[PDB]
Amino acid sequence: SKGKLPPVVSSLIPFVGSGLSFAGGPLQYTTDAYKKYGDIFTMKVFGQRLTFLVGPDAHVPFFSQGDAELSQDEPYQFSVPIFGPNVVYGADLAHRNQQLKFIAASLSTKALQSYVPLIVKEAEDFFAKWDKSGTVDIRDALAELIILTASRCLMGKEIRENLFTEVAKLYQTLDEGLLPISVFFPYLPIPAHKRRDEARLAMVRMFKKIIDERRANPEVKHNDCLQVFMDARYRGEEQALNDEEITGLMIALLFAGQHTSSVTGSWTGLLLFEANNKKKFLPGVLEEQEEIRKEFGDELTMEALNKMDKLHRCVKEALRMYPPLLFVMRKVIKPFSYKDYYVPEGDTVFVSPALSMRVEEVFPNADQYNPERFVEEDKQAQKYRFVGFGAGRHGCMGENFAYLQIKTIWSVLLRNFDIELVGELPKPDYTAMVVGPAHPCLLRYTRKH
Amino acid sequence: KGKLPPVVSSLIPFVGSGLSFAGGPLQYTTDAYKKYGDIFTMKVFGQRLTFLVGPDAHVPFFSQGDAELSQDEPYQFSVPIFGPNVVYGADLAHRNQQLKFIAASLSTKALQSYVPLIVKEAEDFFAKWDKSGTVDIRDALAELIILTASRCLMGKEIRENLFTEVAKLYQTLDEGLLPISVFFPYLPIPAHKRRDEARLAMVRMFKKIIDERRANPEVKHNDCLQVFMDARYRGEEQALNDEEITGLMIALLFAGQHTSSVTGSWTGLLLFEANNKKKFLPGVLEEQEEIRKEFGDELTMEALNKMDKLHRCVKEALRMYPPLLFVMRKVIKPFSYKDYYVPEGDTVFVSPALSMRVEEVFPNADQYNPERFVEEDKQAQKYRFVGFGAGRHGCMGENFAYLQIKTIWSVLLRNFDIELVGELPKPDYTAMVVGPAHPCLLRYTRKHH
Ligand code: HEM
Ligand code: HEM
Ligand SMILES: [Cl-]
Ligand SMILES: [K+]
Ligand SMILES: [K+]
């Protein structure tokens, strides 16, 4: 008599946990919860339980288990239309695990040995272009260098040299496709998603061409991830990876490595040149650069980079204080116990590298910049204290690439310019999934004789 | 089979205001409209979101009142922006009175006094421009609209002495409105917090001005602040306190700034697109010639009120690109619409965007045709055009917005030849108010003979 209900279009209940990456940086809030309730606690949002694990002990059930006990599928569902069909989190475990091993081959110690001269030259040529003096937003600059370097190392000479502007524009459109809504409704047909999908298709076409040329000229042999991906084969399967899968592995490596590396490289300098940090730590860093030039010569090689321990510790301490990924997460498949507690099937568990690395019993004076704290850590064997790169079975495969990229950046900058922080240390910017220093992150450079 | 860790918080927020940050799901909603008709429901986390499309279905939305349809839940995000006991943070008794105060500040009478101030600001602003150049019209109109509002809303003292400081505080409040802020307005993240501190500082700024004006009560001030200082609640001798007065000003900045500047930007971006220019510019310029013939050169209220063809150019930008994609209400009392029933607890939506592309209302709705409004304005059926809403909570600033925007374009059209650089921009859906995506470039040349 009153009437019937209108038609219901759909009834959606998305996974809420991925939303924490777009919550505006609730570190103080979650830290207050940790100080009051201890190292394991739960928030419920829309009835979904989100269970946080803070510090090295609580880290264990998160990093020590594997794919049978903890799932990455829901947390990374956002990435499926970004990387493409049947790539990584859009692949079944059988195929995904193989793809992760192809990626591991491309980022192996051996692969890095061949990339380092390319990374070094891309850096030297980049900073050559700079005037006798000036100012720079390093977050913007390093983002430019790091996409340049990755086009060379990952995508190969043909793209880097001919099609760089084209490929950086495509990557940029993909990236602009990842919005807060995107982690709930990855297939929502909004304009930024439509533009993401077009860009992915355009990247597959660009790589089809290169792959096809290299197939038709198989004598040649090439120094890059693309080559590794063209030579990969799944167990029991005659065929190479198709064009969509190879391109998808490349987009995955850019999403994993571009903003993470550029922001950490940005914080490393922003923190080192802040006036009081600079007085205490810049002397050791410059001195080390002098001793290394003495022992290994002036050219920058893998061997010299591997001994820049003080520089290494400046990067690492930037990462400890300002980790680019505030949360990592998993859906609980098999319940577990931690101290007197049970964590049920269906919870989403979290580790915050930001929270866990401000724990005062782990890292004394957690809020002070002290790169030399790592001298003592190097003696420690307790697992999961430093977790900026994650850990265990899905720990960062790019960690050594990132350290080489960042140390190469700051070795070339330190050798060629004298540097000062304009203004106060930036604050973090919580606008995107990857957290970086707020614009402006201005530095002053003058060339040094 | 065990003990659950501490649950520190369980929350089920209102999901409806999330639509404003969903990246512009116009085609999604349009497709639903086409499949299911003029009333349909989407459920998200079990919350029913019911959409009403076109003039018949708009009737329940715009004709009902506060006992039937509530603004409270939808606008709860605004309470810590505007401050305690202001607008959507006040009870109805006081809220209705505050809207009556706002209405007094925006009446024909008050606008007569504002028009010479608006005109002076625009004329001076564009008088600073070079002989020729390019400009981002969105950035430029945003700057002029905030200057102008500082003078008309806030008074000569603030405009002439404290412009920079108030604009910064306003910018900080704007930066505190994030997607997460519409679900959790009191979440203690750094942007909320900076927001809270900026609001307090604006109250301190206004306390000084209000105290000085009260100490010199014989000085006449023409601005919204004087209207709010003279306001009284029925049965209370005491004036509005300083937080309330500041709150009303902040609400008027949030209501009026981005809406007016994006609509001002689209007005020219559309009019000067090559094809639209060929067709509609000659009549617009012809009109400006006749107005100068009849009224001379002064931009008076009366002359602006005769600019019908320009008025229609604004109205048509607004029709095609409305700055608020959705308006919404929580259903307090169930209602019938034709054969349907809408239950208590639904959130009802009207999209100005979707409704003004309804082809039986607006033929060739995708085409720019300002002169459609010669026939449309003769239509008697209610709620065909809803860019400024309608009914009880319909836009109070409409006439101010049209005065501001027509003043802008009267100054620009008389002094410059203008062209669109490149393609018409696409809408940018990254903020609650939608505008043309940057770059929004116009090339200008000063007129000569
Ligand atoms: C400072 C820079 C970087 C940081 C802070 C960082 C951080 C992380 C973190 C926290 C994870 C853990 C994800 C999880 O458990 O769910 C991870 C995984 C990964 N990272 Fe990075 N990363 C960085 C640079 C890079 C670079 C440069 C690359 C590639 C070129 C890369 C490739 C990967 C890959 C492939 C994984 C997945 C590992 C697996 O599932 O087996 N990362 N990274
Ligand atoms: C082109 C410019 C503008 C557009 C398109 C616009 C549109 C709208 C819309 C759609 C609403 C309805 C909100 C709802 O349904 O709940 C609204 C409300 C309002 N607008 Fe505007 N507006 C504009 C400019 C302004 C300006 C310049 C001011 C003030 C200076 C203003 C003040 C208001 C106020 C106070 C309300 C709330 C009215 C009430 O609750 O009674 N608007 N506007
Ligand atoms: Cl969807
Ligand atoms: K365990
Ligand atoms: K200019």
Side-chain angles (χ1 to χ4, degrees), chain A residues 106-123:
Chain A
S106 84
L107 301 169
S108 71
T109 299
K110 184 163 179 183
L112 270 24
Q113 283 174 340
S114 75
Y115 307 154
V116 159
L118 281 28
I119 295 173
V120 165
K121 182 144 129 52
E122 201 82 66

Side-chain angles (χ1 to χ4, degrees), chain A residues 427-440:
Chain A
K427 286 275 161 33
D429 164 7
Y430 301 100
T431 288
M433 183 167 292
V434 167
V435 171
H439 292 303

Side-chain angles (χ1 to χ4, degrees), chain A residues 104-128 130-131 133-165:
Chain A
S106 84
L107 301 169
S108 71
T109 299
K110 184 163 179 183
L112 270 24
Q113 283 174 340
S114 75
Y115 307 154
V116 159
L118 281 28
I119 295 173
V120 165
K121 182 144 129 52
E122 201 82 66
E124 282 165 350
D125 291 9
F126 181 91
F127 296 119
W130 282 17
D131 309 325
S133 90
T135 75
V136 66
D137 190 288
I138 15 71
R139 185 171 171 193
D140 294 316
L142 301 189
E144 281 152 37
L145 181 51
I146 280 160
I147 187 60
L148 270 169
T149 306
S151 52
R152 172 149 254 127
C153 295
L154 313 190
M155 312 169 192
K157 199 165 225 145
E158 308 106 303
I159 282 169
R160 166 65 183 79
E161 279 179 6
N162 306 123
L163 294 164
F164 173 73
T165 306

Side-chain angles (χ1 to χ4, degrees), chain B residues 142-192 194-207 209-219 221-236 239-277 279-423:
Chain B
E143 296 172 37
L144 169 67
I145 284 160
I146 191 60
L147 280 159
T148 301
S150 64
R151 227 255 69 117
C152 298
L153 285 39
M154 308 177 151
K156 187 187 176 75
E157 302 99 313
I158 278 146
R159 167 67 180 87
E160 295 197 349
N161 305 102
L162 292 157
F163 178 68
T164 304
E165 291 88 342
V166 275
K168 182 54 176 154
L169 296 172
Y170 165 61
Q171 185 195 327
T172 306
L173 295 175
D174 203 38
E175 288 163 354
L177 176 54
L178 301 176
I180 190 70
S181 313
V182 308
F183 299 101
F184 305 111
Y186 307 97
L187 178 69
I189 48 176
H192 294 183
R194 286 179 211 115
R195 165 192 71 192
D196 292 349
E197 286 152 26
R199 187 180 64 72
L200 289 161
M202 206 184 292
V203 177
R204 292 194 292 276
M205 178 187 299
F206 278 105
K207 170 179 165 48
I209 304 311
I210 288 161
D211 289 354
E212 188 67 29
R213 279 181 182 198
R214 292 217 145 101
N216 302 63
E218 71 278 85
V219 183
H221 294 283
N222 174 50
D223 40 60
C224 299
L225 180 53
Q226 202 48 47
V227 175
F228 308 143
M229 279 175 74
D230 297 341
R232 308 281 184 280
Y233 291 137
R234 295 180 216 104
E236 282 162 21
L240 291 173
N241 65 39
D242 299 345
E243 96 196 321
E244 300 198 350
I245 284 177
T246 300
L248 293 179
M249 301 286 208
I250 297 164
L252 291 187
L253 294 171
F254 276 68
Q257 289 291 306
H258 301 325
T259 53
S260 304
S261 67
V262 305
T263 303
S265 301
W266 287 123
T267 296
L269 294 160
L270 286 160
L271 178 54
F272 296 96
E273 190 282 334
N275 265 314
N276 299 334
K277 191 191 189 179
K279 193 163 170 52
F280 295 101
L281 186 59
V284 164
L285 292 172
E286 216 207 319
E287 177 174 78
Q288 286 298 318
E289 292 291 303
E290 300 155 15
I291 293 272
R292 289 168 83 175
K293 187 71 191 161
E294 190 197 326
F295 294 90
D297 262 39
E298 200 182 359
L299 288 169
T300 52
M301 175 73 98
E302 291 71 41
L304 285 162
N305 286 347
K306 280 281 227 298
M307 284 168 197
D308 294 332
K309 289 194 180 201
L310 184 59
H311 189 105
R312 293 189 287 266
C313 289
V314 181
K315 199 170 180 175
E316 185 77 345
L318 176 60
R319 188 188 65 78
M320 292 176 72
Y321 297 106
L324 297 162
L325 293 191
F326 290 107
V327 286
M328 76 196 77
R329 297 292 184 264
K330 183 71 165 178
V331 179
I332 304 302
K333 283 172 179 206
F335 64 88
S336 291
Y337 167 75
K338 298 182 180 178
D339 303 328
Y340 300 94
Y341 176 77
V342 181
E344 175 235 73
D346 271 33
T347 303
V348 285
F349 294 77
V350 164
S351 173
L354 251 69
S355 296
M356 296 191 294
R357 292 320 179 92
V358 176
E359 199 64 41
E360 59 193 348
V361 185
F362 292 113
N364 303 121
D366 70 309
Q367 292 186 3
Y368 179 82
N369 184 9
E371 296 311 275
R372 73 174 68 245
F373 287 96
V374 174
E375 285 322 312
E376 177 63 25
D377 292 344
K378 293 169 194 153
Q379 287 291 325
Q381 171 185 40
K382 284 175 184 197
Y383 323 129
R384 294 165 54 88
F385 186 88
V386 297
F388 295 104
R392 174 62 212 299
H393 293 291
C395 188
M396 277 177 190
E398 169 178 346
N399 287 342
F400 186 101
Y402 276 113
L403 284 166
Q404 169 70 95
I405 290 163
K406 294 151 91 188
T407 292
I408 284 155
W409 289 98
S410 295
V411 177
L412 285 167
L413 282 159
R414 295 174 184 202
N415 297 282
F416 304 86
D417 298 312
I418 292 158
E419 282 160 354
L420 183 68
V421 176
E423 300 287 77

